[PDB]
Amino acid sequence: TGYQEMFQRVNTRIREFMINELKNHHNEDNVFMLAKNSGIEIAKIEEAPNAVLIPAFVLGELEVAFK
Amino acid sequence: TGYQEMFQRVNTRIREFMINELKNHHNEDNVFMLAKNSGIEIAKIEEAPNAVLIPAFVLGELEVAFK
Amino acid sequence: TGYQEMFQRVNTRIREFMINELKNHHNEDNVFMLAKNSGIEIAKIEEAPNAVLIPAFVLGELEVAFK
Amino acid sequence: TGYQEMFQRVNTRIREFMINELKNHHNEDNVFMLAKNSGIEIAKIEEAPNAVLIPAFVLGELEVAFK
C-alpha cells in the first residue's frame, strides 16, 4: 500500500520530467507519432501512457544528443 | 512503426533481465505481493505487467543492495 | 571507437538534463554538498564529475517527488 | 555521509548485475574492447570503471535484444 503510494509519486515525477524534456526540446510529435501507431487517442501529451511516453522521451533525447 | 517493433524488442529484453534478477535472488514474492494488492491475478511472474513487474524488480534490487 | 564518440554524445546529453533538472528545481546545493564531502573542489555544478552529479540528481528528484 | 554509504551500495549492486549480464550473455569482450580504446588496463571485467562497464553493458543488452 505504502509502496503503491511511494511508487506512484516516483512515477509521477518521472512522467513530469519526461514531459518537460519533450516540450523544452519541442519533440512532442514523437508522442503523437507513437500514439498514432498504437491506437491511443490523446489531446495533450500529458494524456499519454508510459508505453507511449517513455519511448517518445528516449527518441527525443537521442535526437537532441546527436544533433 | 519500425520504432515500435524496436522498442518491443527492448521491452522484452528488459522484462527478461528483471525476471531473471527476481528469480536469482528469490524475490518473486515481490511480484505476487504487488499483483495481489492491485487486483491482478497471475500464476507466475512472467504474467505480471510492467506496472507491477518494474516496482517489484526495484524493491528486489534495493533489498539485495542493502541486505 | 565511433561507439565512444557516440557514448560521449549520450553522456553529454545526460549531464545536461541532470544539470537542468537540478537548476530548475533549485537543488544545486546537493552537488556542492556531495562535492565538499568527497574532497572535490568546484565553483559550479557543471564541473562536478558524474560520481557527484548523478547522486545529487537522484537526491534532487526524490526531494521533488516526495514534495 | 549516510548518502556516501547508501549510494556506494547502490553502485555495487548495479555493477554486480551488469557484470552478471555481460557474463551470462558472453559479452565480456565489449568491456575489453572499450577499455583498450581508453588506455585502461584490466584483467577482469570486475576491474572496469563505470565509464567502460556501463556502455559495455548497454551495447550487450542491445546485441541480445536485437539478435
Author numbering:
A (entry chain C), B (entry chain D), C (entry chain A), D (entry chain B): 122 to 188
Paper text:
The export apparatus consists of an export gate complex formed by 5 highly conserved transmembrane proteins (FlhA, FlhB, FliP, FliQ, and FliR) and a cytoplasmic ATPase complex consisting of FliH, FliI, and FliJ. FliP is a 25-kDa transmembrane protein that has a cleavable N-terminal signal peptide, 4 transmembrane (TM) helices, and a relatively large periplasmic domain (FliPP) between TM-2 and TM-3. Here we report that FliP forms a homohexameric ring with a diameter of 10 nm. In summary, we have presented direct evidence that FliP forms a homohexamer with the help of the FliO complex and that FliPP–FliPP and FliPP–FliO interactions are required for efficient FliP6 ring formation.
